[PDB]
Amino acid sequence: EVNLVESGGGLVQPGGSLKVSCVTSGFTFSDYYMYWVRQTPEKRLEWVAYISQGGDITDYPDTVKGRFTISRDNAKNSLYLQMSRLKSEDTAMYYCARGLDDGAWFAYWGQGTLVTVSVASTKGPSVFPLAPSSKSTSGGTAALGCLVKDYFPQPVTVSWNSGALTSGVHTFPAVLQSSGLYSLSSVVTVPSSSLGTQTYICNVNHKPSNTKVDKRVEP
């Protein structure tokens, strides 16, 4: 199955350089034109570069022309984007995509790799439990969660009971606080009768600061 896996995204200080990569599979890399598109925080999309299959032709918008460089390694089935002269404005989720012979630009997309251009430093979050109480119990339903506080940059991934508990989960979008750090909450609704018998654990991973913490939530 055609797969596009991006990587290399992280925190870079303004003026720095970074090289994100895109490893493909499920199709003959050498036959297609490749692309890099990005989504800014305001959820806006922008095409940032394309490259001929032979690596001979390249093109970029004027917002990125001169600083970014697209490349491909037909042997390693990889696509690259060396970014330079990075500005805050370059902070976005970068995607790699490939055409469709019939006549489409971005038919296949990767998962996206976040690049944050900031002067601030990486911080691991603190995870606090949102313990179930009579204040968090309505009917046969109790609510509980975790507060993943004070971290930079994005993102964090929260899971429950190693992904076993999926229904009733509400992991909210992160909010940037005045401190310049993010904070999010993951919440799950359970039958009040399960409390005290079933184990509820939120798994929090924040690769940038290498943080991984499993917090057991109890009433």
Binding site: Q39, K43, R44, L45, E46, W47, P61, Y95, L100, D102, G103, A104, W105, F106, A107, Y108, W109, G110, Q111, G112, S126, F128, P129, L130, A131, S133, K135, S136, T137, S138, T141, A143, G145, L147, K149, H170, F172, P173, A174, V175, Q177, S183, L184, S185, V187, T189
Partner: protein
């Protein structure tokens, strides 16, 4: 290029239409125009719906159709379904500059649902760290419009809380919101009654969920 509308609140079974207008004559029937439409569902990468103004990508339901004339290209959705919610984007890839449309947020209208509110007092671990974050959770409601107000000893709090809202739930078309009041252990200690009053269309009277610090 202009993309209309910005928000498209539609009901199930209803018809929907999204349009993108260029300043130039972009559409060239008989020629070959690369006018495309993408759908991006909550927390997912964008996906190809239609290419070359009217061809559907594999998998895409026939409920989706696209057409265009000179300066305009449109996406028509006959009979909206629940899993159709997300942001729609048109891409103009024939005339340089190749632009993406600003996006259209498709919202599914539904009957009003009142939120169940739960209040979570700060944990000792956080208290031990020096701050106290009290969370108010409005769960599964519609419409998105809701008003959460914090009361500390009957005093209305201002500027010290933050709200977060999830996108619309595909399963039931509801929203969830979260308000966090953050204080320093000091100020937290200085008060007893912590109340969270919510006001939503589904509630005839505003609900107040409170608690007494420590010895409740």
């Amino acid at each position: 290029m202009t993309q209309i509308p910005v928000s498209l609140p539609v009901s199930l079974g209803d018809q929907a239409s999204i349009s993108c207008r260029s300043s130039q004559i972009i559409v060239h029937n008989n020629g070959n125009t690369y006018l495309e439409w993408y759908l991006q569902k909550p927390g997912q990468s964008p996906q190809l719906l239609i290419y070359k103004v009217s061809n559907r990508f594999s998998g895409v339901p026939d409920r989706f159709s696209g057409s265009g004339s000179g300066t305009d290209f449109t996406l028509k959705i006959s009979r909206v379904e629940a899993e159709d919610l997300g942001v729609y984007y048109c891409f103009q890839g024939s005339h340089v500059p190749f632009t993406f449309g600003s996006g259209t947020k498709l919202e599914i209208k539904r009957t009003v649902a009142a939120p169940s509110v739960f209040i979570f007092p700060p944990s000792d671990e956080q208290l031990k760290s020096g701050t106290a974050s009290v969370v108010c959770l409005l769960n599964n409601f519609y419409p998105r419009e809701a008003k959460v107000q914090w009361k500390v000893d009957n005093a209305l709090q201002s500027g010290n809380s933050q709200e977060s809202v999830t996108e619309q739930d595909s399963k039931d078309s509801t929203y969830s919101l979260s308000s966090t009041l953050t204080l320093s252990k000091a100020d937290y200690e200085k008060h007893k009654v912590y109340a969270c009053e919510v006001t939503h269309q589904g509630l005839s009277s505003p609900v107040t969920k409170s608690f007494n610090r420590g010895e409740c």
